Amino acid sequence: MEQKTLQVEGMSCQHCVKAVETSVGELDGVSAVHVNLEAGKVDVSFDADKVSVKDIADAIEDQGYDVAKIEGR
C-alpha cells in the first residue's frame, strides 16, 4: 500500500497516457493511478507486497515502454 511515482518518459504520440495507466490499473493490488506524464508525474498507489513496484513497471512494459522507475519513496 505505497503511494509512489513510476516516473514515465513520454515516448509515443497520444495513446500512451492511458496505456501507462491501464497497465498498472489492471493489477488487483493497485489502489490509485494518477497518470500525468505530461506533468512529469504519475501518482500510483499500489500494493508493493503482492506486486512490487518492479512488477508494476514491468506491467507497463507488457503494453507500453514508458516507465523510467520509482522516483521517490
Curated annotation (Swiss-Prot):
The copZA operon is activated by CueR and indirectly repressed by YfmP. Its main location: cytoplasm. It is found in: Cytoplasm. The keyword Protein biosynthesis does not apply. Chaperone that serves for the intracellular sequestration and transport of Cu(+). Delivers Cu(+) to the copper-transporting ATPase CopA. Functions in E.coli to transfer Cu(+) to CopA missing its first metal-binding domain. Residues 2-68 form the HMA domain. NCBIfam families: chaper_CopZ_Bs, copper ion binding protein. This is Copper chaperone CopZ. Changing residue 16 to S: Loss of copper binding. GO terms for molecular function: copper ion binding. One of its GO terms (cellular component) is cytoplasm. One of its GO terms (biological process) is copper ion transport. Coiled coil: none annotated. Cu cation binds at residues 13, 16. Induction: By Cu(2+). Gene3D superfamilies: 3.30.70.100. The lineage of its organism: Bacteria, Bacillati, Bacillota, Bacilli, Bacillales.
